[PDB]
Amino acid sequence: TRNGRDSEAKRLGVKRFGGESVLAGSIIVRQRGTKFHAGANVGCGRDHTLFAKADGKVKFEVKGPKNRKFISIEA
Amino acid sequence: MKKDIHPKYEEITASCSCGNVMKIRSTVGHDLNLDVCSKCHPFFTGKQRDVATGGRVDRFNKRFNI
Amino acid sequence: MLQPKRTKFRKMHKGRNRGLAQGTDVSFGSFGLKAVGRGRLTARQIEAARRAMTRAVKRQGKIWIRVFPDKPITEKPLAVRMGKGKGNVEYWVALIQPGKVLYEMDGVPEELAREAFKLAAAKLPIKTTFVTKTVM
Amino acid sequence: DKKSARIRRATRARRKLQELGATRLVVHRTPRHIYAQVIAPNGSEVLVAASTVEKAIAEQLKYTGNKDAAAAVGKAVAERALEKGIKDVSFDRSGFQYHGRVQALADAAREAGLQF
Amino acid sequence: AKLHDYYKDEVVKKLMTEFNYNSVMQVPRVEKITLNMGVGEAIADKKLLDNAAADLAAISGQKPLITKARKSVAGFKIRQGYPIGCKVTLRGERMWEFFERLITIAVPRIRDFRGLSAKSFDGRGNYSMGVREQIIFPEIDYDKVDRVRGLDITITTTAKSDEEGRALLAAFDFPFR
Amino acid sequence: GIREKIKLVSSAGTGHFYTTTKNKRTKPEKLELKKFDPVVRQHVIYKEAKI
RNA sequence: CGACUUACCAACCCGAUGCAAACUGCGAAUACCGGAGAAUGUUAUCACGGGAGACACACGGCGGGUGCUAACGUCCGUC
RNA sequence: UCCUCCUAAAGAGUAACGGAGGAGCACGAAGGUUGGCUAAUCCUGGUCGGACAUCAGGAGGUUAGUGCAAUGGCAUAAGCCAGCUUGACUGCGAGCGUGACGGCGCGAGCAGGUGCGAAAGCAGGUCAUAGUGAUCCGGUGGUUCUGAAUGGAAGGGCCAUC
RNA sequence: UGCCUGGCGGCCGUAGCGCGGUGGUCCCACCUGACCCCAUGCCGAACUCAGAAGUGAAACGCCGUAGCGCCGAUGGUAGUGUGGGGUCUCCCCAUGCGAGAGUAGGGAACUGCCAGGCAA
RNA sequence: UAGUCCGGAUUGGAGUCUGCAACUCGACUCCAUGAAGUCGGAAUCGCUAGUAAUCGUGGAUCAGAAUGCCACGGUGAAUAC
RNA sequence: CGCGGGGUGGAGCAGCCUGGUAGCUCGUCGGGCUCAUAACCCGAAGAUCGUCGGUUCAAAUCCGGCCCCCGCAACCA
RNA sequence: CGCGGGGUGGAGCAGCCUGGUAGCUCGUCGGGCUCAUAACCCGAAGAUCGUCGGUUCAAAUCCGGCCCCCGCAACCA
Ligand SMILES: [K+]
Ligand SMILES: [Mg+2]
Ligand SMILES: [Mg+2]
Ligand SMILES: [Mg+2]
Ligand SMILES: [Mg+2]
Ligand SMILES: [Mg+2]
Ligand SMILES: [Mg+2]
Ligand SMILES: [Mg+2]
Ligand SMILES: [Mg+2]
Ligand SMILES: [Mg+2]
Ligand SMILES: [Mg+2]
Ligand SMILES: [Mg+2]
Ligand SMILES: [Mg+2]
Ligand SMILES: [Mg+2]
Ligand SMILES: [Mg+2]
Ligand SMILES: [Mg+2]
Ligand SMILES: [Mg+2]
Ligand SMILES: [Mg+2]
Ligand SMILES: [Mg+2]
Ligand SMILES: [Mg+2]
Ligand SMILES: [Mg+2]
Ligand SMILES: [Mg+2]
Ligand SMILES: [Mg+2]
Ligand SMILES: [Mg+2]
Ligand SMILES: [Mg+2]
Ligand SMILES: [Mg+2]
Ligand SMILES: [Mg+2]
Ligand SMILES: [Mg+2]
Ligand SMILES: [Mg+2]
Ligand SMILES: [Mg+2]
Ligand SMILES: [Mg+2]
Ligand SMILES: [Mg+2]
Ligand SMILES: [Mg+2]
Ligand SMILES: [Mg+2]
Ligand SMILES: [Mg+2]
Ligand SMILES: [Mg+2]
Ligand SMILES: [Mg+2]
Ligand SMILES: [Mg+2]
Ligand SMILES: [Mg+2]
Ligand SMILES: [Mg+2]
Ligand SMILES: [Mg+2]
Ligand SMILES: [Mg+2]
Ligand SMILES: [Mg+2]
Ligand SMILES: [Mg+2]
Ligand SMILES: [Mg+2]
Ligand SMILES: [Mg+2]
Ligand SMILES: [Mg+2]
Ligand SMILES: [Mg+2]
Ligand SMILES: [Mg+2]
Ligand SMILES: [Mg+2]
Ligand SMILES: [Mg+2]
Ligand SMILES: [Mg+2]
Ligand SMILES: [Mg+2]
Ligand SMILES: [Mg+2]
Ligand SMILES: [Mg+2]
Ligand SMILES: [Mg+2]
Ligand SMILES: [Mg+2]
Ligand SMILES: [Mg+2]
Ligand SMILES: [Mg+2]
Ligand SMILES: [Mg+2]
Ligand SMILES: [Mg+2]
Ligand SMILES: [Mg+2]
Ligand SMILES: [Mg+2]
Ligand SMILES: [Mg+2]
Ligand SMILES: [Mg+2]
Ligand SMILES: [Mg+2]
Ligand SMILES: [Mg+2]
Ligand SMILES: [Mg+2]
Ligand SMILES: [Mg+2]
Ligand SMILES: [Mg+2]
Ligand SMILES: [Mg+2]
Ligand SMILES: [Mg+2]
Ligand SMILES: [Mg+2]
Ligand SMILES: [Mg+2]
Ligand SMILES: [Mg+2]
Ligand SMILES: [Mg+2]
Ligand SMILES: [Mg+2]
Ligand SMILES: [Mg+2]
Ligand SMILES: [Mg+2]
Ligand SMILES: [Mg+2]
Ligand SMILES: [Mg+2]
Ligand SMILES: [Mg+2]
Ligand SMILES: [Mg+2]
Ligand SMILES: [Mg+2]
Ligand SMILES: [Mg+2]
Ligand SMILES: [Mg+2]
Ligand SMILES: [Mg+2]
Ligand SMILES: [Mg+2]
Ligand SMILES: [Mg+2]
Ligand SMILES: [Mg+2]
Ligand SMILES: [Mg+2]
Ligand SMILES: [Mg+2]
Ligand SMILES: [Mg+2]
Ligand SMILES: [Mg+2]
Ligand SMILES: [Mg+2]
Ligand SMILES: [Mg+2]
Ligand SMILES: [Mg+2]
Ligand SMILES: [Mg+2]
Ligand SMILES: [Mg+2]
Ligand SMILES: [Mg+2]
Ligand SMILES: [Mg+2]
Ligand SMILES: [Mg+2]
Ligand SMILES: [Mg+2]
Ligand SMILES: [Mg+2]
Ligand SMILES: [Mg+2]
Ligand SMILES: [Mg+2]
Ligand SMILES: [Mg+2]
Ligand SMILES: [Mg+2]
Ligand SMILES: [Mg+2]
Ligand SMILES: [Mg+2]
Ligand SMILES: [Mg+2]
Ligand SMILES: [Mg+2]
Ligand SMILES: [Mg+2]
Ligand SMILES: [Mg+2]
Ligand SMILES: [Mg+2]
Ligand SMILES: [Mg+2]
Ligand SMILES: [Mg+2]
Ligand SMILES: [Mg+2]
Ligand SMILES: [Mg+2]
Ligand SMILES: [Mg+2]
Ligand SMILES: [Mg+2]
Ligand SMILES: [Mg+2]
Ligand SMILES: [Mg+2]
Ligand SMILES: [Mg+2]
Ligand SMILES: [Mg+2]
Ligand SMILES: [Mg+2]
Ligand SMILES: [Mg+2]
Ligand SMILES: [Mg+2]
């Protein structure tokens, strides 16, 4: 053949889901671009990884002018 | 405007041979001397004299005259 | 022989020809050849059935071809073992679900439009039927 | 349009400031008049507001739209803000280059006592 | 400032009667005069553009911007961010001073000037002249320049149509065909 | 290949150093960044040097 | 250099149709993650230690790659 | 060996000599940060100037751009200019993700000491995911460690790095 | 209390366009000047400063009009978990879930908190 | 010491004579026009003194139409081992 | 069918695997030389690079398909 | 890993250890030559030392780097 190569899989996706209790530091979403965005008490690292900045329950929202998905935390 | 970088934009007197004296401001020096202006240029007469040039039948009649 | 003029990808998966068709209504022309059966029409079959209609109705009338291939079919050479790559694209097919209007005619009599579609249907693999442009 | 270009030029500050959850001092400048208002960290309700459009301040000044007028508002807002109990705030320049009237307003707000 | 005051004192009036304008702001006013000089031959000789800038800086008051090439193209052998021409975007006070000097004493020195094109409008009142030589302006000394590199003048206005924008210029005794 | 590696050495202090890459052909002059020396515990002018 | 004729060939928008594993302005059933609560189950769970075997699988049904929608073929997912 | 897309059955993962493409670097500014900007393709008009340089307008609305493939992303722009600079910083690290493991990744906050901004703040390399190899054995500089009787030293160790 | 207009959020297109009409006492915008503060990689177009002669022309508001965009049922259709059956590269019963598209239509948004002016 | 006050081609216009007649197709004149050309590649020609070179001049044919032909005289060389 | 290498004025060769440049030798056309032809001398033209597509600011030169062309391999039973 | 030599017109050379004066040979255009061609002969057109830095009256030259050019023989993750 001419081809037959492939990269190792990156285990990207929503790790902790909506309504799930998480501890401060817990990664919520591993993903490439900002498919989800950082809302209240959530960070956004160099890898665009959304992580909890405070102990609470995860909350997914669909808010903004352009109608983007935001991840917030509420204690 | 930004000072230093630009050239010296000084006032000067334009005076053509027609008689139209006219102060202006430009990068020249001391004085000016012009040939023509917006007044005294042949465009209002120019178009009258330029368009009415053709005429072949009368040119023949001027030679024969009969 | 009908074929896409350039394509994104040379080779395509096999897939599965399931469900019902979408081009069911006789849209442009008066009459039409509807596919009762399920299957796939090669580029050769379409041209062969087009020639059989066109030559039956003569110069007069107008024909539409609602189906177009755009699905390449690979085939492995003779006396070649399995694997060592996907085979080479030989021919092109159009997947035909039940209900799909294949051809449509216009500007001909009803009795002589049928006789033409029989000759076309004879070339095709799929079981077909005659349909008229109804209202709504 | 100019306005729209000023809004999106400001937006980055606003959105960064609402994420922190801080009490912002918005300052809307205008050819005639200069406005200022302290807004609660939620963003909706206003706690303190002052401007040269207010006759209480307009009656005193020479002209409503200059550095000395901006200082008079900048003093006023901060003078109310301390009575309400506000002290630690942020300063939303609101798409206006921090230089003239808004700088005078901010400096007057600092010198009045509003610690930010 | 002479043509500037002429606009306000006269012309402001003359145009009101033609198109029965509701307000004084409806009348077209002249916004900016943009002198361009796409020298182009600066690919070979780098100084040749510095000579053109010296000529634009003479013709206008202010010093020109050296315009970079927007995109790379093979047809002329140029690349992204290469200095290819000069421009001056003069407006306000010196604009009216230049606009007088253009029509009153520069146009008349155009070689065999018979009439300027009245059909040279953009469909939105913005006029565009193109002068062949530099010598037509009296700011350039004769034994200084050694190349006939023309510029092009572009008068930008607030009019919404070329017919509406023609009267504006025509009202300044602008020589049309 | 091409882009070699260098040793940014501290001026004022102990022989602590950083290491970075550098293109030597395009940039023939030497670096002079102002990085943190942790032995002195201070920001110091770190000059370029070879390994 | 002034310009007429024309058995004539297909643009980008219009309206009407199709098609797509590597197209998506939409979009299920399921499956998966978390919490709440009954009841049921020989703790079924997870944790640490002692011993292993095993790491040639087969076919059948569903989703598929491959082959010819060939093979008691081949390769995966799932029972 | 590594990265991207599909195959992959809407969590993760998932094979074949299945289908298509890439990588083995680049960069002292192409990093940091404050201040500004906003794109392709046209249609017009315009000195040479043409099918295409530069200017002016309009219509467009991201059709572009992103150091390099693809996918996901980007207007608050992560795109494009600009001014100061060295956070491409040392010691840590709550907690998570991903690994059979060796490993790999993300990370608020803390201590020290810095840039930038008026500050709010931001900054522990670059839109993200490729740019890479374990140990052993040596080399180089350092060091509050060892120092085969005792002082040293060699050789070790520990740091940093090849 | 209403009528106005600003600032600032909630909501993100039933919230946007095209179209037609309008507002200028304030408010807002163009505007007026540029010794200055500061500004253009040229230009007071920007940004900035000082002002009040004009104006509501453009902008922005604001009210109208379905030319578009958008929202959008019901019934059906397609898929489909579970269990069964076929004529078994396809489908069909039983039972649950049930779109997309397209119709009937809805539609010129709706509200918070200060702040100023105007008929009360 | 310049494509020049060098060259004077080429063209537009206005004419003059001859001649039945000047557009194909004459000559000359005036006005404007102002080209190639900066001493010529391989080659190559004539010329041994009033000759070569160079300046004008006339005639024949001829209504008109020479830069040709045939004649005439001005200045007048170099070189021939 | 696998595997390298090719395809450039009329001929044979460079330039091609390091992207912007088209040379060399004959032949051809024009003029010389000769009584003439050859030889010889002096000028001149002549190839968008197999073809169709990409990538790119730009392709003879990079990459892909397809049409000829050489060289190599198609073995154990 | 090194100590060493070596670095000029387009290129192959020397000259470079013994600081004040960069040669020499192929590429170079005009001659003279001959009814002519080849030769042969004569003169012309080009580097202030790859390049940057210290001292001293004078620095390719004395001394340090770079870009490198290597001769080699060593080279055991
Ligand atoms: K598995
Ligand atoms: Mg694989
Ligand atoms: Mg992958
Ligand atoms: Mg894999
Ligand atoms: Mg592996
Ligand atoms: Mg970070
Ligand atoms: Mg499939
Ligand atoms: Mg279908
Ligand atoms: Mg349909
Ligand atoms: Mg094979
Ligand atoms: Mg910013
Ligand atoms: Mg008031
Ligand atoms: Mg310091
Ligand atoms: Mg057609
Ligand atoms: Mg349509
Ligand atoms: Mg897919
Ligand atoms: Mg799909
Ligand atoms: Mg739709
Ligand atoms: Mg969606
Ligand atoms: Mg649902
Ligand atoms: Mg369920
Ligand atoms: Mg559960
Ligand atoms: Mg649980
Ligand atoms: Mg539970
Ligand atoms: Mg529970
Ligand atoms: Mg309970
Ligand atoms: Mg228990
Ligand atoms: Mg447990
Ligand atoms: Mg367990
Ligand atoms: Mg055990
Ligand atoms: Mg095994
Ligand atoms: Mg196995
Ligand atoms: Mg076994
Ligand atoms: Mg198996
Ligand atoms: Mg089986
Ligand atoms: Mg199956
Ligand atoms: Mg099978
Ligand atoms: Mg059996
Ligand atoms: Mg099997
Ligand atoms: Mg998948
Ligand atoms: Mg998956
Ligand atoms: Mg799944
Ligand atoms: Mg497996
Ligand atoms: Mg590869
Ligand atoms: Mg690197
Ligand atoms: Mg910079
Ligand atoms: Mg940054
Ligand atoms: Mg528009
Ligand atoms: Mg793009
Ligand atoms: Mg791409
Ligand atoms: Mg950046
Ligand atoms: Mg950016
Ligand atoms: Mg500083
Ligand atoms: Mg510095
Ligand atoms: Mg500095
Ligand atoms: Mg680094
Ligand atoms: Mg990384
Ligand atoms: Mg301390
Ligand atoms: Mg600290
Ligand atoms: Mg500082
Ligand atoms: Mg500071
Ligand atoms: Mg701070
Ligand atoms: Mg950052
Ligand atoms: Mg970057
Ligand atoms: Mg990147
Ligand atoms: Mg990467
Ligand atoms: Mg080993
Ligand atoms: Mg060791
Ligand atoms: Mg040693
Ligand atoms: Mg020591
Ligand atoms: Mg210690
Ligand atoms: Mg000791
Ligand atoms: Mg000791
Ligand atoms: Mg010791
Ligand atoms: Mg002992
Ligand atoms: Mg002792
Ligand atoms: Mg001892
Ligand atoms: Mg002792
Ligand atoms: Mg030691
Ligand atoms: Mg050691
Ligand atoms: Mg230790
Ligand atoms: Mg609105
Ligand atoms: Mg309107
Ligand atoms: Mg209107
Ligand atoms: Mg009105
Ligand atoms: Mg009106
Ligand atoms: Mg008032
Ligand atoms: Mg102005
Ligand atoms: Mg202004
Ligand atoms: Mg209006
Ligand atoms: Mg209007
Ligand atoms: Mg209303
Ligand atoms: Mg209505
Ligand atoms: Mg209606
Ligand atoms: Mg109605
Ligand atoms: Mg209902
Ligand atoms: Mg079943
Ligand atoms: Mg079933
Ligand atoms: Mg049953
Ligand atoms: Mg039965
Ligand atoms: Mg059966
Ligand atoms: Mg329904
Ligand atoms: Mg629906
Ligand atoms: Mg719908
Ligand atoms: Mg309808
Ligand atoms: Mg209706
Ligand atoms: Mg409304
Ligand atoms: Mg209402
Ligand atoms: Mg209230
Ligand atoms: Mg001279
Ligand atoms: Mg000439
Ligand atoms: Mg002359
Ligand atoms: Mg010439
Ligand atoms: Mg010449
Ligand atoms: Mg001569
Ligand atoms: Mg000769
Ligand atoms: Mg003579
Ligand atoms: Mg004579
Ligand atoms: Mg005679
Ligand atoms: Mg003669
Ligand atoms: Mg050649
Ligand atoms: Mg010949
Ligand atoms: Mg050929
Ligand atoms: Mg491209
Ligand atoms: Mg080429
Ligand atoms: Mg030796
Ligand atoms: Mg002779
Ligand atoms: Mg080794």
Swiss-Prot record, chain A:
Name-wise, this protein is: Large ribosomal subunit protein bL27
Q: Drop me one GO molecular function for this one.
A: structural constituent of ribosome
Where are the membrane-spanning stretches?
none
HAMAP family linked: Ribosomal_bL27
A Gene Ontology term for the protein's cellular component? cytosolic large ribosomal subunit
Q: Which gene encodes it?
A: rpmA
Decide whether keyword Ribosomal protein is in the record: yes
Q: Does the keyword Transferase apply?
A: no
Taxonomically, the superkingdom here is: Bacteria
SUPFAM superfamilies from the entry?
A: Ribosomal L27 protein-like
> NCBIfam families, from UniProt?
L27
Q: Name one GO biological process term.
A: translation
Report the source organism.
Answer: Escherichia coli O45:K1 (strain S88 / ExPEC)
Which keywords describe this protein according to UniProt?
A: Ribonucleoprotein, Ribosomal protein
Q: Return the Gene3D superfamilies for the record.
A: 2.40.50.100
- Which family, according to UniProt? Belongs to the bacterial ribosomal protein bL27 family.
UniProtKB/Swiss-Prot annotation, chain C:
The protein's matches in Gene3D superfamilies, at most eight in alphabetical order, are given as: Ribosomal protein L10e/L16
The molecular function terms in GO held by this entry are: rRNA binding; structural constituent of ribosome; tRNA binding
Q: Can you cite an annotated GO cellular component?
A: cytosolic large ribosomal subunit
Q: What keywords are assigned to this protein?
A: Ribonucleoprotein, Ribosomal protein, RNA-binding, rRNA-binding, tRNA-binding
Q: Does the keyword Ribonucleoprotein apply?
A: yes
Query: Is Lipid biosynthesis set as a keyword in this record?
Result: no
**What's the superkingdom here?**
Bacteria
What processes in GO biological process is this protein linked to? Answer: translation
Concerning its family, UniProt says: Belongs to the universal ribosomal protein uL16 family.
**What NCBIfam families has UniProt attached to this entry?**
rplP_bact
Subunit structure, interactors included: Part of the 50S ribosomal subunit.
Q: What does this protein do?
A: Binds 23S rRNA and is also seen to make contacts with the A and possibly P site tRNAs.
Q: What is this protein called?
A: Large ribosomal subunit protein uL16
According to its UniProt entry, this protein's organism is Escherichia coli O45:K1 (strain S88 / ExPEC)
From Swiss-Prot, chain D:
Per the record, the GO terms for biological process are: translation
Which protein are we looking at? Large ribosomal subunit protein uL18
| Subunit-level organization | Part of the 50S ribosomal subunit; part of the 5S rRNA/L5/L18/L25 subcomplex. Contacts the 5S and 23S rRNAs.
Q: Name one Pfam family in it.
A: Ribosomal_L18p
- Native source species: Escherichia coli O45:K1 (strain S88 / ExPEC)
GO molecular-function terms, A-Z: 5S rRNA binding; structural constituent of ribosome
Family (UniProt): Belongs to the universal ribosomal protein uL18 family.
This entry carries the following GO cellular component terms, namely: cytosolic large ribosomal subunit
Swiss-Prot/TrEMBL keywords: Ribonucleoprotein, Ribosomal protein, RNA-binding, rRNA-binding
HAMAP family, from UniProt?
Answer: Ribosomal_uL18_B
The record's annotation in InterPro entries points to: Ribosomal_uL18_bac-type, Ribosomal_uL18_bac/euk
Function, as annotated, reads:
This is one of the proteins that bind and probably mediate the attachment of the 5S RNA into the large ribosomal subunit, where it forms part of the central protuberance.
From Swiss-Prot, chain F:
Quote the InterPro entries the UniProt record gives. Answer: Ribosomal_bL33 (IPR001705), Ribosomal_bL33_CS (IPR018264), Ribosomal_bL33_sf (IPR038584), Ribosomal_zn-bd (IPR011332)
Q: Which residues form a coiled coil?
A: none
UniProt KW Ribosomal protein keyword: yes
GO terms for MF: structural constituent of ribosome
Give the keywords, sorted. Ribonucleoprotein, Ribosomal protein
Please give the GO cellular component terms listed in this UniProt entry: cytosolic large ribosomal subunit
Q: Does the keyword Ribonucleoprotein apply?
A: yes
Biological process GO terms, please?
Answer: translation
- Which SUPFAM superfamilies does the protein's record reference? Zn-binding ribosomal proteins
Assigned protein family:
Belongs to the bacterial ribosomal protein bL33 family.
UniProt protein name? Large ribosomal subunit protein bL33
Q: Which organism is it from?
A: Escherichia coli O45:K1 (strain S88 / ExPEC)
What lineage is this protein's organism placed in? Bacteria, Pseudomonadati, Pseudomonadota, Gammaproteobacteria, Enterobacterales
